[PDB]
A paper describes a structure:
ATP-binding cassette transporter B6 (ABCB6), a protein essential for heme biosynthesis in mitochondria, also functions as a heavy metal efflux pump. ATP-binding cassette transporter B6 (ABCB6) is a homodimeric Type IV half-transporter comprising a single transmembrane domain (TMD) and a nucleotide-binding domain (NBD) with an N-terminal extension (TMD0). The TMD is responsible for substrate recognition and translocation, while the NBD is involved in ATP binding and hydrolysis, providing the energy required for substrate transport. In the present study, we determined cryo-electron microscopy (cryo-EM) structures of human ABCB6 in complex with a Cd(II) ion, which is coordinated by two molecules of either GSH or PC2, at resolutions of 3.2 and 3.1 Å, respectively.
However, in the presence of GSH, only Cd(II) significantly increased the ATPase activity of hABCB6core by ~2.4-fold (53 nmol/mg/min) at a saturating concentration of 800 μM, compared with the basal state (22 nmol/mg/min). The structures of hABCB6core in complex with Cd(II) and GSH (or PC2) are shaped like a lassical inward-facing transporter in which the substrate-binding cavity within the TMD region is open towards the cytoplasm. Along with two molecules of GSH (or PC2) with an orientation perpendicular to the membrane, a Cd(II) ion is positioned within the transmembrane pathway of hABCB6core below TM 7 bulge loop (also known as plug). In the Cd(II):GSH structure, the central cysteine of GSH interacts with the Cd(II) ion, functioning as a major coordination site for metal cation binding. By contrast, the glutamate and glycine residues at the N- and C-terminus of GSH, respectively, are not directly involved in Cd(II) binding. Instead, they form a network of hydrogen bonds and van der Waals interactions with residues within the cavity of the transporter, primarily from TM 9, TM 10, and TM 11. These interactions help to neutralize positive charges within the binding cavity, particularly from the arginine clusters (R435, R439, and R552), thus facilitating the stable accommodation of a Cd(II) cation. Consistent with this structural analysis, alanine mutations of the GSH-interacting residues (R435A, R439A, N498A, Q501A, N545A, T549A, and R552A) led to a partial or complete loss of stimulated ATPase activity. Compared with the apo state, binding of Cd(II):GSH at the interface of the two TMDs brings the TM bundles and NBDs toward the center of the transporter. The CASTp program calculated that the cavity volumes of the Cd(II)-bound structures in complex with GSH and PC2 to be approximately 2312 Å3 and 2573 Å3, respectively.
Residue numbers in the entry:
A (entry chain B), B (entry chain A): 240 to 826
The structure:
C-alpha cells in the first residue's frame, strides 16, 4: 500500500549521514532494544524457577542466589509499563542527542529552502499557516520515527516471540489461546478506533468554532454601545457550549467503549488460559510455577498494548503531516533563477530600456513598451497618479520578477544573464515604510556588511550626521530597539535607512520617498545627505512632490504603462503641455 | 500550608449545588472509588489462595471455581496501570457528565461577570491575555479537581491500607520495609521534581523565544530587498537552535534521573522484601503463596506512584492558574454602576450642561466648564481641530465614564443616579467605524430588538430603502456575511447602521458623521434618511464638513476644553467670529 517508498524515506532520515560519532550511538541503542526484548521474555522463566525451588524445600543458598539474580534482572528490565527499567532509560539518554541532531538538520534545511523562494508564492499564503505547517512537519519527522521504531515494532516482536515460546516450550493449546486473544484485541481496537476518529474530529471542529465565537464578543465591544444585548450574547454562548458538550460526551464514551472492549478480550483470555493451566496442573502434567509464569507473562505482554490506540491514531496523523511538509519542500515553482554562470561587471552604471512589456497580475496588462535611458549620475524621477505602476517598475529594476517580454540591460549587459547576488548588492533601496526587526542598533547598522567592523559604523555616524543623535541616547549601542523596545518616529527610521545605505556603498539608488509630514529644513537636510551619498552615482526617485523634481535632470510621467515625455529638461520646459499639471501640483 | 481554604473552595465547586439529579451521581462515583480501592487490595488474597490450593493438590472442582472467581475479580479490578478495570471506566462514564455540568456553569459565570466590566479596564489590557487567563482558569478548575480527587487521594489511601495489611496479617517487618521504601520514593521524587522544574521552565522560555524569532524573518521580507543576508539569518537561527537544544538536553537528562532514582528505590525495596520473605518461607514460618502475594502487591503500588511523581508539577501549576482566575473574578474595578435603586422615565429629551469638568487621562484636564442646552429636533453640531474632545463628550452622553465634577441632567433628571438600562435604551448611537462579527445580515438587522419578529425587519427594509440591495443578493437574508463571508462597502455598513437605528426607534440620536468619501447623491439620500428618522427627534452631529452644519440650528467649537460660540443659527452667522474658519473650511 505504497508503504515502501515511505519507509525508504524514513530510513533515509534515520541514519545520521554526517558525523561518524553517532552511528555508534545508534548501534548501541538498537543493541539495548534487543537486550530489553530478551529480558522481557527471560524474566518470567526466572520467576518460575524461583517458585519451583521454593515448592520443593530447596536449601537456603540456592534460593538466595536465585532470588538475588531475579531481583537484579527485574531492576534491569522494565519494572512496570515497559518504559521504566535501566535499559529503556539509557536508550532514551542517547536517543535525545541523536534526535536533537536530526531535528536541527531538518529544521535548518526546510528554513533555508523556504527562505529561498520568490515573492509571489510568499504573498500567495499567510505566514502563520506556513509556519504551522513547518513546525508540525519537523515534529512529525521526529515523533513518527520515535513512536514506530521504539513502540510498535518492539511490541509486535514481543507478541511473536511469546507466541513462539508458548507454542514450543509450554504446550500446543496455549499458543492458540494467546494468538486468538491478541488477534481479537488488535482488530477490535483498530475498528473502534476508526469510528471514534470520526465522532472526534467533529469535536475538534466544534471546539474551534465555539472558541472563535468567544473572541468576537470581547474584541468587538459594541454591545453596550448599541443596546442592552448582554442577554442575547449569553444565550448564544450557552447554545454553543451545549453543542460542544454534546459532541464531547459522545467522544468520551467512545473511549470508554474501546477501553472496555479491550479489558474484556484480555480477560476472556486469562480465563481461558488460567483455567486450562490449572486443569493441566492438577493432573501432574505441569508444575506449580507454570501457573504464575503464565499469569505474569500475559499481564506483562498486555501492558504495552494499552496505548495501541493512541498510537494508531498518531502514526496516522503524523503521516499526513509528513505528506504536507514534503509536498511543501518538493515544490520547484520558484521561477526567478539564474543562468549557468556569468558575474556582473559594474563599470559605470549604464541603464537602458527596450520596449519592455510586463504585467504582474493576469488577464490585463499594466506595463507595455516602456523605454528610457538614464545617464550616470543623473537623478531621474518618476511621477504619476495613485497607481501601482511606479512600484512595478521599481521591482523590475531589482530583478524581483521575470520579464514576460522585452529586455533589461545594465552597462551593456542584460540583467537576466547574471546572478542575483552582485546585481542586488550594487543597488540600495529605501522603501516607504522602513520597518525593523527586534535587535540593537549596532547589528542593525552592521546589517549592511557582515564583515565590516565598527570602523564603518563610526564612519557612517560621522557622515550621516547621526553621531550626536545616537550619543544623545544614554543607553548606548545596547539599547532595546524594535517593537520589544522603545518606539521611534518615521524620520528616525528613514535616517537609519540612509545609514544602512551608506553601509552598503551601492552603485545605484532606487530610492522611494516617504510621505511623512515634516518641516522643510529636515527634509532638505535629508535630501542633501541623499545627494551626497548618490553624488557621481545613478539615482532614481519616486515622489509626488516637485521639490525633488525641479532640480532633477529628467522627469518621466507614467500613465498605465505609457510615457509621453522624453528628452532633456529644457525640452520639457519648452513643451508647455501638462506643465499646467505641474503648476497646479506645485501648490 | 494555606491548603485549607483552597480545599474548601474545591469542595464547594465539587458538589453540584444545583440540579438534584447529580448528587446521586457523585455518591455513586465515590462508592465506585471505594469499591475499586477494596478490590485492588483483595485480589492478591485470592491469588495467594489459588497458589496455596494448587500446591496441596486440591480437588478439581474447588480449584476451578476459585480460579474463575479470581479471573472475574481481576477483570473487575484494574487489570494493569490502574485505569483499565470496569469500575474505573464506569466512574469516568459518569464523571464526564458531571464535569461538563460544572465547567459549563463556571464558564458562563465568569463570562457574564467579565462582560459586566467597564471600558477603561478593557483598554488596560488586551483581550487575548484575559481570554487566555479565563480559559486556563476553567481548565484548571476541572483538571485539578479530577487529578486530586481521583489520582492522589486513592494512591495514598492504597499505600496506607497496604501498610496496615502487611503490618497486621503478614508480619512485623514487611510493614517497616514497605514504609521505608515508599517514604524514600516520595521524598526523592519531590526533590528531583523541583530541580527539574527549574531547568525546564528555562526550556519553555527559550522555546518561546526561538519560535517568536522565526515569525520575524517571514513577516519582515526585507532580506532580499536589502542585501544577500540569507547567511546572517541562517547563522542566527542556527545559534538559537543550538541554545534551545542545550536546554532541552539538560531537561531530558534530568528526567532520566528521576526515573531511575525511582526504579531503584523500588528495586532496593523489592530486593529486601523478597529476600526476607524467602528466608522466612524456608523455615516453615510462611506459605508458598505468600511470596507471589508480596511480589504482586509491590508492582501495583509502583504503577500508581510513578505517575504520582509526575502529578506534583501539575497540581502546583494549576493552583497558580486557579489563583489567577479567582483574582480576576474577585476584581471590583467597575466604577460606572448604579445606586441602590431608581428607574428612569423619559418624557421628551431635555438636555442641559452645567459647568462640568472631566479628565479621562491623568495629570492635566481636558474638558472643563462645558455648558450647552439643545431644543428638541435641533441638530446641534461640534467642530474643532484634530482633537478627541468631540468623541469624549460623545462618550459622556452615553454614561460610559463617571463625571469628575459637575452636574449632568436629562429631562431635568440627573443621570449619575439612574439605571443604565433605560438610559442606553432610549438613545441610539451611530459610530464611525461600525465593526460587526461573524453572522448573517439578517441577525445584524434583528439586533435592534431580540423580541422583534420579521415583520419589523420587512418594515424597516421598506422604510430605509435597503430592499433593493437585499433582492440584489441571490442568497437573500441567508447570505454568509462578515469577515469570514464576503466583504461589504462603507456605505452599505453605514446604511445597515441606520437600519438598526430604526429598529431601535430611539428618542435621542447621538449620531456621529461617517468619514467616507462618496458621491454627493448618495450622501444627500443618507441625509434625507437621517432627517426622516430624526424628525421631531433630538439630534447631535459631529463632523468636519459644512454639509451637516449649513442646516444645523446651533454649532459649537471646542478649543482644548473651551467653548466660545453660542446662540441661534442666525445669531452665530451674525456674530462675525470664526466665520473666517467656516469660509476657509469650505474650500
Ligand atoms: N484508551 C486508550 C488510552 C490512551 C489514553 O488514554 N491516552 C491519553 C493521552 S495522554 C488519551 O487518549 N486521552 C485523551 C484522549 O482521549 O485522546 C487506549 O487504550 O489506547
Ligand atoms: N517518568 C515520568 C513519566 C511521566 C511522563 O513522562 N509523562 C509524560 C507526559 S504524557 C511526560 O512527562 N513527558 C513530558 C515531560 O518530560 O514532562 C515521570 O515519572 O514523571
Amino acid at each position: 500500500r505504497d508503504f515502501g517508498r515511505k519507509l525508504r524515506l524514513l530510513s533515509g532520515y534515520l541514519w545520521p549521514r554526517g558525523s561518524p560519532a553517532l552511528q555508534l550511538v545508534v548501534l548501541i541503542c538498537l543493541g539495548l532494544m534487543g537486550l530489553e526484548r530478551a529480558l522481557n521474555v527471560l524474566v518470567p522463566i526466572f520467576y518460575r524457577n524461583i517458585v519451583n525451588l521454593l515448592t520443593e524445600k530447596a536449601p537456603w543458598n540456592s534460593l538466595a542466589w536465585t532470588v538475588t539474580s531475579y531481583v537484579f534482572l527485574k531492576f534491569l528490565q522494565g519494572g512496570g509499563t515497559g518504559s521504566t527499567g535501566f535499559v529503556s532509560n539509557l536508550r532514551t539518554f542517547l536517543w535525545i542527542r541523536v534526535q536533537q541532531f536530526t531535528s536541527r538538520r531538518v529544521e535548518l534545511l526546510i528554513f533555508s529552502h523556504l527562505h529561498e523562494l520568490s515573492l509571489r508564492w510568499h504573498l500567495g499564503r499567510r505566514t502563520g499557516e506556513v509556519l504551522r505547517i513547518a513546525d508540525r512537519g519537523t515534529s512529525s519527522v521526529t515523533g513518527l520515527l520515535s513512536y514506530l521504531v521504539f513502540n510498535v515494532i518492539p511490541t509486535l516482536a514481543d507478541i511473536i516471540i511469546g507466541i513462539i515460546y508458548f507454542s514450543m516450550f509450554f504446550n500446543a493449546w496455549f499458543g492458540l489461546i494467546v494468538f486468538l486473544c491478541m488477534s481479537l484485541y488488535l482488530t477490535l481496537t483498530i475498528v473502534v478506533t476508526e469510528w471514534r476518529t470520526k465522532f472526534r474530529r467533529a469535536m475538534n471542529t466544534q471546539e474551534n468554532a465555539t472558541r472563535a465565537r468567544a473572541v468576537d464578543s470581547l474584541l468587538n465591544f459594541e454591545t453596550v454601545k448599541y443596546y442592552n444585548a448582554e442577554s442575547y450574547e449569553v444565550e448564544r454562548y450557552r447554545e454553543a457550549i451545549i453543542k460542544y458538550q454534546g459532541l464531547e460526551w459522545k467522544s468520551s464514551a467512545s473511549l470508554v467503549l474501546l477501553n472496555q472492549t479491550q479489558n474484556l478480550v484480555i480477560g476472556l483470555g486469562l480465563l481461558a488460559g488460567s483455567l486450562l493451566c490449572a486443569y493441566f496442573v492438577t493432573e501432574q502434567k505441569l508444575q506449580v510455577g507454570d501457573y504464575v509464569l503464565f499469569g505474569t507473562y500475559i499481564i506483562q505482554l498486555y501492558m504495552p498494548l494499552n496505548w495501541f490506540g493512541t498510537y494508531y491514531r498518531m502514526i496516522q496523523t503524523n503521516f499526513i503531516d509528513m505528506e504536507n511538509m514534503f509536498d511543501l519542500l518538493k515544490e520547484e515553482t520558484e521561477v526567478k533563477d539564474l543562468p549557468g554562470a556569468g558575474p556582473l561587471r559594474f563599470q559605470k552604471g549604464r541603464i537602458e530600456f527596450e520596449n519592455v512589456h510586463f504585467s504582474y497580475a493576469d488577464g490585463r496588462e499594466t506595463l507595455q513598451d516602456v523605454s528610457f535611458t538614464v545617464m550616470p549620475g543623473q537623478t531621474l524621477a518618476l511621477v504619476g497618479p495613485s497607481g501601482a505602476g511606479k512600484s512595478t517598475i521599481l521591482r523590475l529594476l531589482f530583478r524581483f520578477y521575470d520579464i514576460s517580454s522585452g529586455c533589461i540591460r545594465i552597462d551593456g549587459q542584460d540583467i537576466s544573464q547574471v546572478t542575483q547576488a552582485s546585481l542586488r548588492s550594487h543597488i540600495g533601496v529605501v522603501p516607504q515604510d522602513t520597518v525593523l526587526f527586534n535587535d540593537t542598533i549596532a547589528d542593525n547598522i552592521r546589517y549592511g556588511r557582515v564583515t565590516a567592523g565598527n570602523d564603518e559604523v563610526e564612519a557612517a555616524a560621522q557622515a550621516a550626521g547621526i553621531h550626536d543623535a545616537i550619543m544623545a541616547f544614554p543607553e548606548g549601542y545596547r539599547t532595546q530597539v524594535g517593537e520589544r523596545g522603545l518606539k521611534l518616529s518615521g524620520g528616525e527610521k528613514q535616517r537609519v535607512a540612509i545609514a544602512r545605505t551608506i553601509l552598503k556603498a551601492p552603485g545605484i539608488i532606487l530610492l522611494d520617498e516617504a510621505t511623512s509630514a515634516l518641516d522643510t529644513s529636515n527634509e532638505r537636510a535629508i535630501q542633501a545627505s541623499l545627494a551626497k551619498v548618490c553624488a557621481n552615482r545613478t539615482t532614481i526617485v519616486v515622489a509626488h512632490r516637485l521639490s525633488t523634481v525641479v532640480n532633477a535632470d529628467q522627469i518621466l510621467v507614467i500613465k498605465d504603462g505609457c510615457i509621453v515625455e522624453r528628452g532633456r529638461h529644457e525640452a520639457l520646459l519648452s513643451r508647455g503641455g501638462v506643465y499646467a499639471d505641474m503648476w497646479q501640483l506645485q501648490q
